[model samples]
Target chain A: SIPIPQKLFGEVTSPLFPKPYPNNFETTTVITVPTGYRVKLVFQQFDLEPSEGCFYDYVKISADKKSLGRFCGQLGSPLGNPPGKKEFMSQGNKMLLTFHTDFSNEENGTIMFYKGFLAYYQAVDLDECASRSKSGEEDPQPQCQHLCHNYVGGYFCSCRPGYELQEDTHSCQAECSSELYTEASGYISSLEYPRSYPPDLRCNYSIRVERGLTLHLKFLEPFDIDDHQQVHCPYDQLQIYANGKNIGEFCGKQRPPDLDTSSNAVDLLFFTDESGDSRGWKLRYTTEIIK
Target chain B: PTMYGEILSPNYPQAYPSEVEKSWDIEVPEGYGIHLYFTHLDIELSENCAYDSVQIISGDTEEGRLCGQRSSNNPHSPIVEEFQVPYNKLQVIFKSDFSNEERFTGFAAYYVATDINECTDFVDVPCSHFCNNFIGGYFCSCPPEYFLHDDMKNCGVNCSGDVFTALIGEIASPNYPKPYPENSRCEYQIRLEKGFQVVVTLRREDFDVEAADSAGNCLDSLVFVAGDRQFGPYCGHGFPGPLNIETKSNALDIIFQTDLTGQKKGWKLRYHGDPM
Candidate 1:
């Protein structure tokens, strides 16, 4: 049994650290802090038996299910630099420290000893916004999608003026809708055309004309939306509602053919998925003479 | 920034621009502090804050590197709260990533300058007696029994009119162990029998009145007078082996004077009447 409990301070070491630790020993210590806090582990003295790949005596650390690192040796194990007073934080509230050793300890082919390691851990505030740096970058990435407001132990999400925070609270949903167009012949195009349309959108545009008049339509070229050529147009779709029937749905890079709908009114609809950056489509409409 | 103001992300209520980095540097007077509190926030977030974030730098220290959204609706949300800047300086940094996948309003916060409590926060024995705190500065006061020195610092006592006539007697400045009083004048006289001479002495450590300017024009003066023949007018660290007075002088007059500046721990001298 270890001398420390979860959620707070404690130090762990090889079975006989400071003295030549015995052979053939492996131990696991789990530290779990409160929900708002995370754990930080620092190795003060690390002198494990070193080898080529650290497959021998070593210390492995993991936060939650992800592996932080595995170190061996005083300076650093070939696996990586020895964690000497290097503080590592847990992604969440839990951390697992595992110490392992082989059946024997030897150095330079023979006649040497190993003292093991010394590491202490404690709980620290987990700044959610501090999407800690990775690779070689020095800046912390944000966690919120639109605007991230960090609290002591958590964070909140919000959206822009023309946008509204989604129920998920992390994504900002763009407001793209319209009223009926009374003009007989008018142009209806996607927002910010020539550029990719914003994702997660459902915009509706309809046209009304005199009775007994039919509407002819022409879709401009460069039609594009995230598509897979499925049995049905999905991901990002543009639908044409004519007269009294569900005419057709379109998507992908191909521009749909020009068509005539015999009706006094026509409706246009566009739907997009949660992702993608495809420059959208545009179209023109005209109220032709009635038969 | 001025003493108090509000900072909002460009396009604030509207979607903030992407791939932008803006900074606001706020300042207050020397004895003042800055208090910052956020009223609105909306920033894109990533696990590593590679998206959008705010860094609150109080002086050189990064008080908070904040991101995410927080409000009363969710207490568990990650958001930096109202915080006080340690120094009189504050720097608020807001940065955005390559894009605002979700329309982000950015953030809004208010910063106000507050009077730093010097009596409690700044100073080593700030006030000798009672102290009153005020905006931009503080005032020190002495108890009813004492008066504030002209230095506008510590309390004081009259070092003058103290006569010394015994065979072995000493005279010292007020608040001896502490810094001496400023703008004070002292007249100490030694009247001995005809068969004796006055022997005055001082020690190196015992003398520490404020030093004069580099050119030797003394700011404070310590002179000994015996009739028209004065011993000397001296200031600085001290010259304290002894002030030997001859029996021919009727009285050994020790006059001490100080100006209204740079008060330091003063000197104490021993004068013994030696039989001639």
Candidate 2:
């Protein structure tokens, strides 16, 4: 928890970090994180002499004199409960760090290893990657666009399938453009129809013809939109709309039976998420005053 | 050429001669400096080494005129018993005037040539970086990032074809806080996005370049280029203000040129970008 004098963010390490700290060296740092934030400590590296009491070579973190934990030994090894990404928070905004080495000789039932502790302290909060939702629907600050990949001190992100990378640090926008059709009779189909439809898209299509004419809808070649037998189209789905009434939401390998609409206009919405290589559906229509 | 030698006055250690003049010119193999010193000195004393003086020359310069008896080692007179030649040659001039009231056993001098570790015997620091001494000679070298100067002694930053994204500290003349080297050209280039402009500010209190001749022409030039527009190739300055480039498509190139030179404790400029 203890860093240097005072900064928003910085690194504090045992003397000659990443190398054997000088023997018989005792150091202390009183870290002062700025206001409105708490001192957050996460270890990038840790290695020191081991003992159940860590009395020889140890790193002690405290608030004034109240000890939170004293750590020693290798990262994974158990000596004085070595830190394993278990982040520590300072009491209030200040903390104390003490590094002690005692010229511990080998013959004295002890040993020393190189690679001293390197701890990073930032004036902020954390546990970000775990809290962020996978589908990117529920987002807070610093969350990944689609998926989170955790690393030391930070996280990484990648776009979901079929979502185009925005070429920014972390953003993947669904390429689902909304379009309108105004002709008396036209054709509608999913992207690359007669071929597999894209994933993670939510497309909207509108069809409008003569006001008084009823439309004769005809189904042609088609591909399946993804679906799950478990109620909600958990994978992919589509729902067609006409006038103001709601039409049934359809998904899976089955196509909706042809229907004579009450009016000449129809609205269609298609959706999907992640991978489902399905060749989607197509519909053609001709408007008539009467049959 | 000899490795070591010793010489004395014409009358041996005992004072015997008068109205005589003699000399010993000593030379040694190249790359050795002579260790010349006097064990005994009792030549006839005179003012300004005027009479019966032993004039000594080591290498390129005249060392001193040796004279006076029972050496008055004091504030006015200095008797340094040992002399290390600055180079390979050592010469001593001996003489006694027509007459002498006091019998003096003239002088005795010994000489030898040994390796001159210029690294230690240096009068002034020549190498800008590291210097190494060998058996008879020494050399200067630089780190991998630098190049040896044309003088073959100083280690100079090879401004040769280097571009800086940003000058973290300051861009200075060859041997900074000191004079610039000759036959060098440095073009400091900086570019950020369109909204960024470079501000060149003199970090030094005042700038100095080889001053201009009476005809209002600079001997060394410092100019800047931004886009198609050009800034002054200014020199021999008075008031130097911070230069802010209102860049359209920001790219700043500062050109510092020097010809076979003159000495000037050069200049420094730090450049950083600010949003327009």
Candidate 3:
């Protein structure tokens, strides 16, 4: 027979509201075990129903003068249900009790309530579980292992090698790493800003760095164009990519007075050491055909 | 008077010097006289080096017998004269006819007219407690018994006292704090003036009073009885109504009392006097 005493799971008057009101209101209690023999509690209770336009009545519980939890409800109605379940462990013995039941009537009654105890058990140590698995239970239930080692209670399973846990799924497979990415680079031979190609230029001729590639660029002579005077280039343009996605144009400038043109040349350099789909990259320096 | 032979100063490139071409056209309202403004003429060219012409002819044909003409000799010369014409349907031509070949450019014309605005971009000063708009600017002010501040855009209370008297009316809670705290009290001292009623607004943080007393006893007073209704102890009654009373010396404490229950913190006192 399990030694989990039923007496330790009985109901105590909810400290939500004080004496004078009728009794037998019910609330649940929850108990949790962390690391071998360590226990924590969570308690809650509801307040009496208030009359129309009447203020809310509150149920409060505290541990050693410090508030543990609070429950708020209407005023007036006599037997308010316990504010759900409030769980606490026997901390060698000291607990605070408080309950507030307000009524629309000038004269309101009070009542006394007892606290209830839920479940109590010696918490299993994670290191002990690990040792037990190595001794004989090599194929122990993963749920038991998780609770005994991770110090939490829930239904869970472990993933296979080379795979990780999915946020919403228990089963796991190949990893999907690239969500958002940032990049660092020294200089680029040719680059465009904002990723958009000029009206008269070909978009595909721009250079794009792959997901995982090391590139070193060096160039001479920066290009500059005057208003109403179009100067066309006949070579490749510069481009950059982050986690397999293009960022923006590398090097394009608009005419002045109508457009704010920054400097024309970009001297940026970047490199990648690891070979994978989760890398950062960029391209620079593209030219337009002189039509 | 006799007109002289036309001069053909063809347009030249900016890098070279040359003469311009000459041609002209005129347009006019059905019966209105020409109103010419020579200084108001404005022109733009797509190519810096294009030749344009203006001329006065003797006949009404497209290729009329020309009497006199003026052509653009350089890129900066005017192609269209600024004189108003009396006839409709004027024809003009542009070219790069010069010793040094330069690309023919495009041209556009405009008149220098006033820039009229239908809606001036002045900001609309909202109607506050008071509003006044002046030339090119505006000002806002608060009404009597009210002052303006940066935080809340409404009038704030100016009453202050230690033990307030319930003169002409009951004290009410301020509307600032919603669902006022369970244990709230106010102290003030007021002087009574006969024939006038004073309206007091009392705002509470929370609803219901556990008990009623002169001091802070109402804050921790326990609630024992249960009923379908509750009542305010001394002054303010109902959710958003005022509590009325007659004024006397230190009449505040004698009128208001409350019993407090529950283990919580944070309480304040607020009271204002108004004519009934």
Candidate 4:
């Protein structure tokens, strides 16, 4: 019979973090092994509690003072006001941390360490955005241009032609109105550049308003991808009344991350829910033929 | 010497020239004592019925005597006393002390000695728990909630108020061979009680608590001794894998340990034996 040895990962509350903001402290963790043998770390999870009012500092994992990976957490404004929320939670495995300062005297926090083993892998490759091969396959009208893949980290995508890219959708669209594109409707049509372009991605668009004109806007979700990446074209067209007189209407795509899409071009509407007048009456009108 | 034609009974001894019948020789070991029995009946009789009186002369002229007499309850038969032979070579002479001399029908002798076998037998009995077999007999016992069978066969688990049923044949405790040279595996299992700690401890000796899970596989292992802490494999109600617990019956065959130092003290386990 083989003898399987039991081991202790370690205990909680070893005072491994900084306090009072700006004070730095260091300590060494010891792991014992069998005689004539060495122990190699395969996996680890560092459980940390951030202090109130204090932003996240840096953290690191190491052996003999050598660094592992830098611990990165989500960046979001602290949720509550001063006297602040009691604890901020950040959980991760296999990383080191370097805090900016010691927690305030009134601040209370904790850090727990958990570890396990890892299986071996031969070779690994990653892609973050949609590649040419994956294009159209995700959506007949691919929303994003780039693709990414790996163990851990951030990745992004690029847009296509005749459409401006929305940061959230990563898809292209005709720049005309802010209410024309959504998760349900497909990208709109107008004399506008593709959404691939950066700055004017959601701004550059075309609209037309003539006397007695009724503009109808219909929304078509992106046909190339699943609902998660779908682009719903907007509806609720803008009715142009010149000095209380009716006029003709033209329509285009809406901004990214909206849920309003329509079936016709004239009924599609776009309105910013800000203060009256300045926000209520902004409309686009264009007569140029679509290229 | 008597001639082949001699026929008269009373005068035969004189007429036949008194020739000696066939004779046999016997010798005994130097340091041991012996008992001999004689009988006239051709049929084998109990030692109590054989005549006891008999006599023999040793090569050293030291004479040995046997006592024979009829049992009081059986008038037709006599009890024979074994000839107490003290030393080596011996010569025997039969003599009748009576007015009418008796004629012998048949005779034979038997010898008896003492002997014994010295192998010891024992077994471990069940208590806290876990019974094991050693050299001669076996042992019975278990940690807690465990007990050795009355007959000293194996260990049994009792879970009172536990969510899971007991798992059999899954617990194992193995031992390294030494002194007498041997290999042993201790295995057992118990049901899961929603709220309880089942502590299973193994030591090189009965109470060596410095043991560690050198391989880091023990249920929860410690790198160094944390003063007053006993180290070994253990599990709570919800522990997983070797500690993997379920609401169902579970049995374990202990295969791993924190390398044992010195000698194994066997398995000592404890839990709430009664179901809660």
Candidate 5:
């Protein structure tokens, strides 16, 4: 018997695939492909002893150690000598095929002659993006941007920067203004305020108090931004700057504390993307005299 | 109340109280299936389980009625059974009447809610080239160089077959969105027709690689086969940075293979035939 290799394509069969197999045998065949691929096994011809739960003799298929099924018995008509044909696909790259038989129940009931199984196995590619997005009665539609690019066994949405993925998920919209300059006090929000923002968006706003007065800004509600580690806001972010000096960058659902700028002006920068598009941020701003 | 979890008799492992009827209603998310596996089952056995029994009801169908004592027939062997409910909702009713001569502990079952794999379960599933299964359902797809036909279960050939005339285009492994199947191979030969060289730029994020040998030879790789001169059996992440292949010939062959173990997004190449 030839040992199955890791990366291969084409046909595989029982010990003596075309000929009748022997009883009291146990063997396993493994078929492998590169990462991000799956195995598809099509049984061209199969025949084995008939028993419930495959207690007598059986062929088992598994993917990544998860058993897909255990099959045995005749394919079509047992008397007519017809063959069985079945198709199975795997969820991962590795597929294990195991065949086992007990001491009893020989094929011809004489000694060791038994009709085994023959199968054609091949590797096919999986389209995760299309699978995730296709709407069906059983599955929820995928929320994506302009396109959903499948990778590995999953999918991620894609949108040009400056836009966010909508709640419906399949569409994208701009997140915030390109550039804004506020005089005394003004409001700033992620492009589609109150609604979820799009992906890959960057917006900058500059606020200036009346020359000497200080700037006071209060978040209208709790802000929801994408938090990157426990450290900073890498995806969707809010950065505060006082007189060209960096104050801090914030993200997450909790609203940041009110800001009282020591200088006459502050620059508030906002950035967000498709990964996490929570309710955008809204803030109320005004100029206050120095105490 | 938890959608998918274990359900056990009251005072499990101890004899259940007489004259008791307990019912559990499990409701999973819409469009999901339920699988229940009985880890332990020992109830007073009778003709058709007349004394104590567990009845499983799913949707409008009665799934199973189980009641038995395995220790009587084969001691030391536990009874195990599995049931698959085809609906998102299921009802399990356990009933016991007043009879205290012999008491046995009831059943303990664990349930899991999962999305169905339509390609395997359904008989009339429609897919032309490939069936890609997801959480809730499946979708149809086609291999590269083929387009999905109107029926959505067949593939039609593309105009560009076995040849590349475009200056700049994208190329990727088959089943671009889904994981590729095991033991598969694909090759692409890109010819510029009339250009000095073919410059192929590999996307950094789209590829999988095994560790390199001491001499920096990749075990599982995406190889570039060019007229007795090869670029790599490239493997690993964020590697061959800024790859600009200088082809002595106008054509280049891209071959990819996956050992039965690890797989990734294969590779996406943006190739252009730069003029001399």
Candidate 6:
């Protein structure tokens, strides 16, 4: 019989396990995990009668009754040799194991026909976001109002450009904005310098140089926003509009990379929310005359 | 070429050239299945993968036609989809249309050969008492007290006729380890001394039901009628574990039935009497 555990991980073994098992034995063991998780079964050791057809003794593994395989002989050995260690994973929450033996073996035979088996099992949380993302399933409603970012076990709702995650974190709210043209190189950022800016804010700063000159913008230290490895900027973001087009948007602890405008004028926009205020950000802009 | 490993599209992680097609044929050792798990899939998304597509063919069967952009929109992130083929041979083809509206990172997939235990993996296989697994397939056999039935899946008990009045004995389908014939019916009546109950245990792996009726009853079934109660019309591969039944009377009836077109490993029932 196999012993199942209530925790996320456990192990099971054959009857009289790790020892010589009796003849004419047959048993089935099942491992079940909670919903939203799959079971990974790793066999540390498996030894049974090495027969041509597994006729004398064998073990079977299945998931939800769908047989994955049957084993008798050794793994990585010649055909019909004693099996070595192996591993299996259930597609779902349940895994079934069956072991059977015939009455043909002797307890003290010259060769040890049975040493039983040992296996460890663990439950892994299924990544629903990754699953739906691959299958192209429609985003479920009531989860993310505009954009939904999925993770291992759950998901987070995000907003598109020019919008910030609302106080509730599900919806999006528009912030304030402005445009500007700069004739000289200088620094730019959200209003009130670096000290935590007010909530519900959208500030767009556009810099312009002479027709023959190109604009360059760079951010200083202490730039912080609600961003992550999986998400760029969903709540607070700094967007760059260059050459009459939106180049890109960024947020997070990492400083934004330096940018050189393709045209004479460039637009820089910084948007923030009511929560999660850091040292804010600092930027320096410069204009280089055309050769 | 190898049975297992990884494959990547041309200039992977970089946009693939437009109007080009690439194909790869993978073969594993005999008696194994192919499993393909995609880590990255970023092609042109369309209604039917018309612009850019990845096709997997197993033998002559087309397993899948996959295309489109991942929901994450992050080309570096791996997708959670996988494809599997039951045969040892597979052909994968990638095609990109002339339109380069999107700069995709292309695709990346890993393939592995999984051993298939035909005996247990398939329903109604030709195995009598025991199924010994091999690399590509398996063979069937019967135990010392049993003989392979003509059908090869049923293991017939070497008994004198069907009726057994013994206090402790075993009974099985006419053809034990062999497959039972279609449109066949076998019955056994067990009678022990009065004031004693009979315990019946059924072997889990030994029983196989090919199909079931509309109501989910096994079209070919095993029924146990004990006194006024009937235990099952149990059918299908889902064995009811080991059964323990006590007779209400001194007698119990075991019936096995099958339909045309399909057959399975017959039933094996062990019985012993205990004084009530």
lDDT of 2 by residue, A1-291 (tens): 345444666668777754567778888887886543457777755667777787777888887458898887765443357785578886456778888878762425545245577676656433445564555463444665445443223444544322445766577775555455655666776766677776777787767766888877776655487776768577787877888666868777766788788787787888787885777888887778965
Measured over the true interface residues after superposition, the C-alpha RMSD of each candidate is 20.1, 49.7, 34.7, 56.5, 29.2, 16.8
Q: Which digits, one per residue and each the tens of the lDDT, describe model 3 over residues B23-97?
A: 544333232222222211112222432343223342354332111122444433233344433332344433323
TM-score of 3: 0.17
lDDT of 6: 0.68
**TM-score of candidate 6 restricted to chain B?**
0.59
- Per-residue alpha-carbon lDDT of model 1 for A210-233, expressed as tens digits? 787888889898888777855566
Candidate 4 — which residues are off by over 4 angstroms? Answer: A1-291, B1-172, B176-189, B192-256, B260-265, B268-272
The whole-model lDDT of each prediction reads 0.69, 0.66, 0.30, 0.29, 0.66, 0.68
| Candidate 1 local Cα displacement, residue A255, angstroms | 32
User: Candidate 4 residues B61-98, lDDT tens each?
Assistant: 73654333232234332323344544334455433232
lDDT of 3 by residue, A1-291 (tens): 122322122233443322324343433333333223323333322234333332344444554345665544321122333333344433322333444444332224543222221121222113233333434534543333111212212223333212345564434433322111112223221123223212222222212333334433323333322112253322223333423444433332331121111222222212212222221223333322221
At residue A264, give the lDDT of candidate 4: 18
The local lDDT score (0 to 100) that residue B92 gets in candidate 4 is: 59
Give the TM-score (vs. native) of candidate 4.
0.17
Model 1 per-residue lDDT tens digits across residues B1-276: 356666888965546776888998887767778778776766777775667888888767788877776653544432347797547888888888776555455777767676566787765756765555544566675432245766677665457654443444456668755877788788877775454567666666788766778997778888888877776577777654354545356478777888888888787666655556
Report per-candidate DockQ: 0.03, 0.01, 0.01, 0.00, 0.01, 0.01
Error of 2 at B108 (Å): 2.1
- The sequence of per-residue lDDT tens digits that candidate 4 reaches over residues A68-169 is 433322111132122111221112222122333233322225332211111110111122322335433644433244221111122333322223456665
TM-score of candidate 6 relative to the true fold:
0.39
Indicate the TM-score of model 1: 0.32
Write down the RMSD of all candidates, one decimal each: 20.2, 43.8, 29.7, 48.8, 31.7, 17.3
The candidate that wins on lDDT is 1
Flag regions of model 2 displaced more than 4 Å.
A1-291, B2-4, B29-35, B44-51, B58-62, B71-85, B97-103, B112-138, B142-144, B149-276
- Of the two candidates 2 and 4, the one with more favorable lDDT, higher being better, is 2
Q: Per-chain TM-score of chain B, candidate 3?
A: 0.24
- Fnat of candidates, each listed: 0.03, 0.00, 0.00, 0.00, 0.00, 0.00
lDDT of 5: 0.66
